[PDB]
Design a protein around this ligand. Structure first.
Ligand code: ZN
Lengths: 58, 159, 103, 218, 142
RNA sequence: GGGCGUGUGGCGUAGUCAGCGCGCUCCCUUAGCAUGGGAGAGGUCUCCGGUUCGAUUCCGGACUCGUCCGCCA
RNA sequence: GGGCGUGUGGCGUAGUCGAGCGCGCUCCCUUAGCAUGGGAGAGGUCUCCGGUUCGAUUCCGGACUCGUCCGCCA
RNA sequence: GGUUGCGGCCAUAUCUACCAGAAAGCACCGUUUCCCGUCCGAUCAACUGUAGUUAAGCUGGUAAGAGCCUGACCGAGUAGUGUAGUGGGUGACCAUACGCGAAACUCAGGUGCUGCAAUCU
RNA sequence: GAAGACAUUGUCAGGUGGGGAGUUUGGCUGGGGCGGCACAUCUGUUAAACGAUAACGCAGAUGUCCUAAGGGGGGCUCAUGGAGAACAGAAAUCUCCAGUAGAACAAAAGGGUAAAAGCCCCCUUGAUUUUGAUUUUCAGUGUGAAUACAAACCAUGAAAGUGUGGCCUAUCGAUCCUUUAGUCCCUCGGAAUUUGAGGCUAGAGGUGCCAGAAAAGUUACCACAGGGAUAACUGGCUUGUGGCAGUCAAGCGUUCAUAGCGACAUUGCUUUUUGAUUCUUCGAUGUCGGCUCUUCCUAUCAUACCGAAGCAGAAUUCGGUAA
RNA sequence: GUGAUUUCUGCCCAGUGCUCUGAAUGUCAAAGUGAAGAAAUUCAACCAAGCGCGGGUAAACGGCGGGAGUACUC
RNA sequence: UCGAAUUUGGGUAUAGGGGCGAAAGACUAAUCGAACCAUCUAGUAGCUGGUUCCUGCCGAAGUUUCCCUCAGGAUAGCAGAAGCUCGUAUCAGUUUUAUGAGGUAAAGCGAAUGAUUAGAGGUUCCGGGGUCGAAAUGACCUUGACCUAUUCUCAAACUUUAAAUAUGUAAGAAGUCCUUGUUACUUAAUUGAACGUGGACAUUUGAAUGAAGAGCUUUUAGUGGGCCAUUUUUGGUAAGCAGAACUGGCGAUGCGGGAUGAACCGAACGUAGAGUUAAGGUGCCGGAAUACACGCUCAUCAGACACCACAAAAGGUGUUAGU
């Protein structure tokens, strides 16, 4: 009792029903996978920038 | 059985080329990548470390991470019915800058220059590109260009 | 394969925290103790009528085992394990390969 | 014991040459490809006649051998053994396979059917195209009527349709008759064993003068 | 490991098997279908290498049988005393743990050592027990 | 029909781009009871094709022999 | 029915295109038996028919004959 | 413009056979105490710039040169190919419509350009 | 009378025990069985120039090997060919020239590599520790393999740097249980000390039917649920094979291709052979052969009328209209 | 088990069974003995039958081969 | 077969894994390869059959991965429902421009690898056969190798070159430019890196076309046997055969045409009226020209329309038109 092995028939129709949406891009993407020596300094840089802006517009 | 390894069906894809084998030139090591650059991916078979997979050959992506000898690139891969985000760590021998991006930036700076110079007069800048318009009227003359009559040629064997 | 009897490697023994000298042995399993909880449960389950109550493995397929080296730091006596790939022949006695000599 | 040629007439498969993945083929039945006065010079035989296909099919090596023998026998009987030069311009490189089934009674008890039905080599064939020359003969202008009849007798051994075309070239070369005549009146041709070497304006002048002296003798 | 599994159909003649926890060497193999529908059964007739007894067995063909590791090793005699051979390895190692053979092989070896030939002894290892099977004489390097 | 092994001198087996043992034939020796030694001579490497200076051991294709299956309709 | 191979003196048997041996018995010699040996003999249309060659046991084609192998149904 | 040091592109730069090279620079070249390495101060190491030489390296030029590079309406809109027809043909296959468009071949031309620093009749 | 603290009896323990009990006795598959592994993987191709892509498609390979065949550095250039030198020749060692790799890099194949990734030499253990992220297979799970970093500690070199095993693509394994290493930390719940036991983090012992049951047969005495998803008739598609017919004509036929034949080739037809396939039928279409009886086909054995002959007659052969 | 009468029932005890009044440490349970420990416990020695070693048994299950020389012999 | 191992009445004994058997798996109340009765029991079934009113709106899948998985499930996909946040966009089975990537079709072999036909010129301390030679690393021919310049033909697992069709990215406001703040990162160094403050550039704000609203979430059904057509393509002699790729269909779908038919052509459907057509047709059946125009064909088996229901090689002073 052999049967059909594999096909890709109807698959693109199924995809293009409500399919091929591009992913939503955002301002400020995720920083995971970025180098830890860069992120460790970036935290302190933004902390100092926020403190300077708070002291400027306090 | 079947065989789907990591470098299956990559024979002509990862051959080097004709008469440019050997070591790689130093421009690929002297080129500088920053975060947000748009790069093309083309693997170098002479360098076995930091190789991309065969799917990403000829793919174009965006730099998100810069390390000592490699670059992190973001690709959008169609999986099923949507695109997924893929992060790749590739050595710099397998990437180069995309020239379309720098062409577009040249268009941006020349376009801003045109707008800046024509803002002093207000002459309807018309900064959008336009495609190939139909060609307009013209008068072609026969002075020294009298028409030559052509006819179909009869059949011959020609062997 | 052949592995030398000594090796300079890292020791996380809370006083070394560096590469020290290590003497290597091969890991032996040691005898299965009675009064381990699984052994007690197995004996209690096997007592009485009902026959064999747990599976016994038959379809053996491997011919080798992964070898495990027991490293022992010579300074502070702390021990480490590391495994190797599968090998049919293993020895710790160092008879070094020599190149330009006869068969 | 051989299948009819209609089972292998058409180019249905990819080319399957003898290689290091075949390693067991039968040898071809045609072995001689140039015959007649094959050692003749180039200007001995000005006229050239082609048997050329009009089909896209496969010609068997057995059919090539039979047509070669037929045309050679007819022309040597009517015109002499050394009045022509015949050349077979196709070579059987495609290998034909057979999935041999047993012809015994009650064969299905041991046949296994279409399982593992990859064939074994049994023959060799040459794949021709539209307007591809099978046979080419060069002779003098006094043997046109016998070489056309020889090719016409040879055409019966081939499947499909073939045409007999009298070429405009000089012999087995690729120049026209007046082009070759105006080339050979100068010394810029020089004979070889059967063919002829030509002069070019490129190359070193010393070699171009040790060869081909009569043209520079101007 | 000392021993490794194998399939009955993968086994063939002059190969080693484990039958009733004994190292055995096959002399006969025969496969007969169980029933017309069913798989064939393998009958195995083998001889123990150490003791010489004949041991047989019948199994399914797909069944897995245990197979020993047999190593044959070449040594030179030093002395035969008290029924224990003393042997000498290449690179100069010496063992005295081998017991002398007890049969006509042992008798022929004893007479050959008494009349003074240089004797080359083949001893086999399988499953932790050791014995000597054959001896020759060194034709050169006297 | 298919599958799996098979093939080297009188015999038996090993295997480097054909070796030993045993018979044989000689020679020498031992009273023996039994001998022993030294030399030989002997193989299309199953067969047929492509290579190579050396080819079993390089390669490919075929043959012989021994087995095992060829069932249920 | 088909395939593959085979065919030598009265018998067995050797044959690379240029019919030998052994056995039967013809004769002679030879024998204290419990009967041998030795020496000269006879013996083929190389299964038959055609072609090639210069000449086919030898090469080829056909026929005959013999020996193997595979084959009807539910 | 020549030469040296470090290069970029990596034959228009390579290869074969000849010819030429003022000045300077490279180079060959002289030496073995010291550092160092070899069977061998040949390579490598060190010393002198002295005893010499453009012979070679190197650079440039020559060749109906080989190769390589560029271009062509040269082959050729050819081969191939996306779309279409209730097109042809027993078939094999082939024409047409709307589009895209090669390679070999032939011919013509060319034979390194250049960045930084130093130095030169 | 006999026997006697031995038999017997009771409870445990070892052996024996198809006499009996319970159960099992893989999958894929041009039906099943035998065969094979297409069941976990790897290279090239099929594969139609992104990726993906099947068949019991083709050509092969894996369950290993390596303390160096890993890491770093230095020096050198290979296969082959030519020309030479006592023994020394086809092949021993030495010398020169040419040599884009035609060699080598553990193995299958494909890529990659020339002051090297090859050969030789020197020093070593980065084949180390701690957990994260990413790529392939993919559900964007696991496993395997791999990539780039961070924090240490090392190796090597003058140094820049390079190194988290093998130049790259294969070389392998969950829960439960046992055992080892670390923390010597947590718990044994009325309170302590010491054994013992149980936990936490990281390995090993293995499931190859490789996301991982503990497993022999027979049934012609057989049973049930189903299946035309699936074989054993007929019918249908195909016609290799079987049968029949052509075309061409090297030759046979004393001479002479075609009176009669006809090699090497090649074009067809038929479904009275056997295969191939699985479309219909498994809530059944009564599968040998013979007897009986009707009709149809023609590829004509005889009878009717003819043509041809290597047709003198006789006999015969080839062919036509003809069922 | 074989299946009246008559006439015979050959060879083989290696295997599988069956059977010994043989010989005796190889395998070797529980109880018991000894050592260590604070004890749970661990380790040894000793260790019945049966296996293992040694015999018998085919009117027990069964089995009854190859290569040479000249039926016979090796 | 009929004087006994005879036939038989009544009494009596043996009861279901049990009996009894001159042995057939026979008999044990029409039940026997384990009787009958009741209960457990409404035993389980991935398997077969059935499953009850109307209308409206939307509307599939036979595919991915894992499983003793292959007649079944889980998971993803396809679908419905409930909506939520917003109001013309952080869109698009499309094109253009710019820029990448690929190794198929083709082509090539006097280009590498491999196969391969034929001569020519050379090389013999450097071949083999003959003949002449005392012989000769002798000669003369011939034949083989190797080299040189040519020549004929090829490659799924060959390639310098190399399309068409498909395929990645970009075409701005989350942008560009100017100035200068932070840092424990980095640099010889306010050198750079990243994120910032303040300022300038607006409807041609950065190509075309269209937008039918755009984005987001939860939950759940059915499905997980497919099949056909054009083109590319694999195994096979082939098949209404088996297996793949892209698209369109049938399944799930009626209507007009192909006489007839799941898939072909045309066209997709609320209930009606009028008009015009598609594909197909207009002698009659049959609605519609026995229209018009130029030719060809006469068959003692004419021919008559794609899928499609067949015909070839070879021939013919039949006839027509050509070279
Ligand atoms: Zn330590």
């Amino acid at each position: 009792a052999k049967s059909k092995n594999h096909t890709a028939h109807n698959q693109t129709r199924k995809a293009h029903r409500n399919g091929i949406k591009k992913p939503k891009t955002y301002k400020y993407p995720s920083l995971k996978g970025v180098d830890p020596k860069f992120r460790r300094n970036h935290k302190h840089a933004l902390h100092g920038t926020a403190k300077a802006l708070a002291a400027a517009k306090k | 059985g079947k065989s789907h390894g990591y470098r299956s069906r990559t024979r002509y894809m990862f051959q080097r080329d004709f008469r440019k084998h050997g070591a790689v030139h130093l421009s690929t090591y002297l080129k500088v990548y920053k975060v947000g650059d748009i790069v093309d991916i083309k693997a170098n078979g002479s360098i076995q470390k930091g190789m991309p997979h065969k799917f990403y050959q000829g793919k174009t992506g965006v730099v998100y991470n810069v390390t000592k000898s490699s670059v992190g690139v973001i690709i959008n891969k169609m999986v099923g019915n949507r695109y997924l985000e893929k992060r790749l760590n590739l050595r710099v021998e397998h990437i180069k800058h995309s020239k379309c991006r720098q062409e577009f930036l040249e268009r941006v700076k020349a376009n801003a220059a045109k707008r800046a110079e024509a803002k002093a007069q207000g002459v309807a800048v018309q900064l959008k590109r336009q495609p190939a318009q139909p060609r307009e009227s013209r008068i072609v003359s026969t002075e020294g260009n009298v028409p030559q009559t052509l006819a179909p040629v009869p059949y011959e064997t020609f062997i | 394969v052949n592995v030398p009897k000594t090796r300079k490697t890292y020791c996380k023994g809370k006083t070394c925290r560096k590469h020290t000298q290590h003497k290597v042995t091969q890991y032996k399993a040691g005898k299965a103790s009675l009064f381990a909880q699984g052994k007690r449960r197995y004996d209690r389950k096997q007592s009485g009528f009902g026959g064999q109550t747990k599976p016994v493995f038959h379809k053996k397929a491997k011919t080798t085992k992964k070898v495990v080296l027991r490293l022992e730091c010579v300074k502070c006596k702390t021990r480490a394990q590391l495994t190797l790939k599968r090998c049919k022949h293993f020895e710790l006695g160092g008879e070094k390969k020599q190149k330009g000599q006869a068969l | 014991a051989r299948r009819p040629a209609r089972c292998y007439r058409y180019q249905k498969n990819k080319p399957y040459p003898k290689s290091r993945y075949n390693r067991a083929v039968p040898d071809s039945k045609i072995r001689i490809y140039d015959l007649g006065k094959k050692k003749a010079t180039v200007d001995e035989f000005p006229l050239c006649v082609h048997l050329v296909s009009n089909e896209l099919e496969q010609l068997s090596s057995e059919a090539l051998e039979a047509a070669r023998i037929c045309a050679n026998k007819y022309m040597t009987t009517v015109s002499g053994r050394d009045a022509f030069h015949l050349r077979v311009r196709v070579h059987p490189f495609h290998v034909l396979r057979i999935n041999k089934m047993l012809s015994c009674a009650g064969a299905d008890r041991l046949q296994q059917g279409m399982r593992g039905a990859w064939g074994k080599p049994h023959g060799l064939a040459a794949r021709v195209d539209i307007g591809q020359i099978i046979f080419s003969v060069r002779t003098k202008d006094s043997n046109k009527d016998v070489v056309v009849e020889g090719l016409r007798r040879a055409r019966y051994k081939f499947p499909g349709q073939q045409k007999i075309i009298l070429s405009k070239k000089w012999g087995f070369t690729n120049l026209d008759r007046p082009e070759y005549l105006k080339k050979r009146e100068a010394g810029e041709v020089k004979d070889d064993g059967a063919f002829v070497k030509f002069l070019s304006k490129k190359g070193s002048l010393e070699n171009n003068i040790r060869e081909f002296p009569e043209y520079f003798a101007a | 490991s000392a021993t490794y599994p194998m399939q009955c159909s993968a086994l063939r003649k002059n190969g080693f098997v484990v039958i009733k926890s004994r190292p055995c060497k096959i002399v006969d193999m025969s496969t007969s279908k169980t029933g017309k529908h069913g798989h064939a059964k393998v009958h195995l007739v083998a001889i123990d290498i150490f003791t010489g007894k004949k041991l047989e067995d019948l199994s399914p063909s797909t069944h897995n049988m245990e197979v020993p590791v047999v190593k044959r090793n070449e040594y030179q005699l030093l002395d035969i005393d008290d029924g224990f051979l003393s042997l000498m390895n290449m690179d100069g190692d010496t063992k005295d743990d081998v017991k002398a053979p007890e049969g006509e092989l042992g008798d022929s070896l004893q007479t050959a050592f008494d009349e003074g030939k240089d004797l080359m002894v083949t001893i086999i290892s399988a499953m932790g027990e050791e014995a000597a099977i054959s001896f020759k004489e060194a034709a050169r390097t006297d």
